Symmetry: C3
Subunit: 302 residues, 3 copies
């Protein structure tokens, strides 16, 4: 697709991971993905202008081009390579979106970057772990999946495709609270672990200490995992969800050797609640989640 | 009132609870009640178009007419009979009086209950709580009734408040108030005088909201839910918002702990569309929240017991 | 500034604390502060029309003039001193120094008359002038500030908190709910030995498990609206998601211990940035109106125990 040309050209022209990085996690690469969402997708730009200090005492540094210096160990910098928006003049197809995502992710991954996808409908999850599986067929992938919906009742869902192709060692679904009959069948069938909202709440959300894991984790976050009061900008809201702090806390509990990728999705500008100054509540919430997701890519361990 | 005629006509034509329902909970009947609220009342319609799968792994099935088949125990269906809006718009530009709302509500509740349905009222100002437990008390004079009332306000300082009328008439066995956080001096007096149990916001928060496991009770339970029991961040569409309230999930959790042999009825009220916070697609935040609360309230009607 | 003339004149005429208040907490005096915020500042007026009953079974009584009778039971008198700025007494915007001098003056006056001053609105700068007004009148008293904020707010040398720390007017600072801590913030924390309770930490230990904030000295309570999550208080200049709920804040406030309250500053609210219901009531005004009320309660009921 010619719409992805300027982006793809800049991404494969990205300076590879330097030798100064050896034995260290990262660096992180960030791009805007917009499949299944309106053409105007302002989440990436909103994050890039957001404050850079994290919950945990570290600081993001954002760069438009390389080389990406590996910061000194006493420096709490976390470099992020901004690769910009995938689209820059008619709505591209899902397959075209799939190809652009697969290509960009593959390129970044083989250059030693941790790909972070922001926006879209969740289809990036499929293509990003496929980009990883092609490059590293030996590595077993596990997905931590934050969502109001199990999203395995549709055979075309990114998560279902991956389980059908057998590209996933395991899946952990968090915050589900609209579980259909079909969902329950696929759950038992593929032996998925799940932490549904009501059960996660009655145990004490703050009492969640670890999501134990030994394999590289992909982090997939549907914005609708958050309560509609914190993240209203979603197509299929389910009330009674996580607070932004709840989600941050659980994210911080994710363990593993490395992060294969991150997809933050489900955000639709047309559905947000807006302040009088036209800043959307969901954009505020997700910018924070994206920042602490980036932190986790730099700090994860078993 | 002629404004309720088409509704009332449909209601008394409703198929009675069949023999296949013998010694089972339910079924549930659902109608739109609009007293004290603007004429445009979208909550029932919004709920009707909402997803059917619940927290706990069951699924609502909605029907415009009977017969309502009792599902096999292995299928987790929960039939709901949609009786529609009590007030028929375009049947007159008249606002029914407090008495007309009361009489209409009283009659529909009586009809549904006698036909073996658990009535669920959606909308209005809280007055349906009065007419619904009176309809039950008429039909079942021997039954003791307890009400679990979710509200930011005790709402018992006004002698004309629905809950105070019930106590003054001695129709209630007991009252459990949950989420109160604007308690007047008069509320305190009426509290001690009628020996109400209550669980104020600060108290249950400091105890740990998830530590609430049960509300012990042996009598048939009426569930009354003021939307303003929720924090204005989750349910802004309320006439008298009081900050520092329940989240939607907090409310869901406490609801799930309600015990009893059966539900006599449910009233979910206090939602005013004129006061909501709207998304850019003009969907109300409070409608989102309440639609979820209504679904899980229905689930409680089908699965309530007296244990743990 | 002549903009504060009508206000200051009234404050100076305020009836001093009567003898019936001897060795009792209060009374409380309330005023609207508007430094750094838009000219239209409705938070004071919104609070004044809000319900009077509190979480804990007490009831605010609002009075426009003295004398303030000391009640035997559960009344909590508040003296409304109104807006510091008088609209239509000039279309001119006061300066920071003018805001500071006016606030210093009003606080001095109210404090010397035995009132606990409560400032509503503005940008946090009232915290500077209020504890300085107290420090002038009572140089011997040690002051501690309990500071609710998404930001430590000590990376700017000009910040109200750092000016106090550099002038050595503070015995200690307890910061609650920070979740955007810069490199500079950490340095100043270490240097001035500030105690802090960041969002992630108090959340992970259980927000409801916080029973009290131990303290022996008079407390100044400074509350930035942005300490609350943007979903509860969206009307803030620098939102940081993952904050307190209104009830979380109320619970933690209730835990504050001490012999007395030297003052309260509730700030950070900008009406131009609020989320509004369809009837044009702002979400943040709803939250803060409650925060202000239970804050007033704490000034009347604070004790050093546990
Ligand atoms: Mn979803
Ligand atoms: Mn109420
Ligand atoms: Mn702040």
């Amino acid at each position: 697709s010619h719409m992805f040309s300027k982006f793809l050209m800049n991404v494969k022209g990205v300076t590879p991971r330097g030798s100064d990085w050896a034995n260290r996690l990262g660096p992180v690469a960030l791009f805007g993905y917009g499949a299944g969402m309106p053409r105007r997708a302002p989440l990436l730009d909103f994050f890039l202008q957001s404050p850079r200090d994290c919950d945990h005492y570290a600081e993001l540094t954002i760069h438009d081009k390389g080389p990406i210096e590996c910061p000194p160990e006493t420096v709490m910098f976390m470099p992020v390579l901004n690769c910009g928006q995938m689209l820059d003049t008619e709505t591209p197809t899902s397959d075209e979106w799939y190809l652009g995502s697969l290509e960009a992710s593959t390129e970044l991954l083989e250059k030693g970057y941790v790909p972070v996808s922001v926006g879209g409908d969740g289809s990036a999850t499929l293509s990003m772990v496929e980009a990883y599986k092609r490059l590293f067929p030996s590595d077993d992938i596990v997905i931590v999946h934050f969502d109001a919906h199990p999203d395995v009742s549709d055979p075309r869902s990114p998560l279902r495709v991956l389980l059908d192709k057998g590209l996933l060692k395991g899946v952990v679904s968090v915050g589900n609270r609209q579980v259909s009959s079909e969902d329950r069948k696929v759950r038992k069938l593929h032996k998925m672990f799940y932490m549904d909202m009501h059960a996660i709440y009655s145990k004490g959300l703050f009492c969640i200490r670890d999501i134990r894991n030994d394999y590289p984790v992909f982090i997939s976050i549907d914005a609708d995992v958050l309560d509609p009061a914190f993240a209203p900008a979603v197509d299929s809201p389910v009330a009674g969800g996580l607070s932004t702090r709840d989600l941050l806390h659980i994210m911080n509990g994710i363990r593993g050797p490395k992060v294969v990728g991150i997809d933050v999705y489900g955000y639709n500008p047309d559905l947000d609640v807006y302040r009088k100054d036209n800043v959307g509540l969901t954009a505020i919430a997700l910018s924070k989640i994206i920042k602490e997701g980036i932190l986790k890519a730099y700090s994860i361990s078993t």
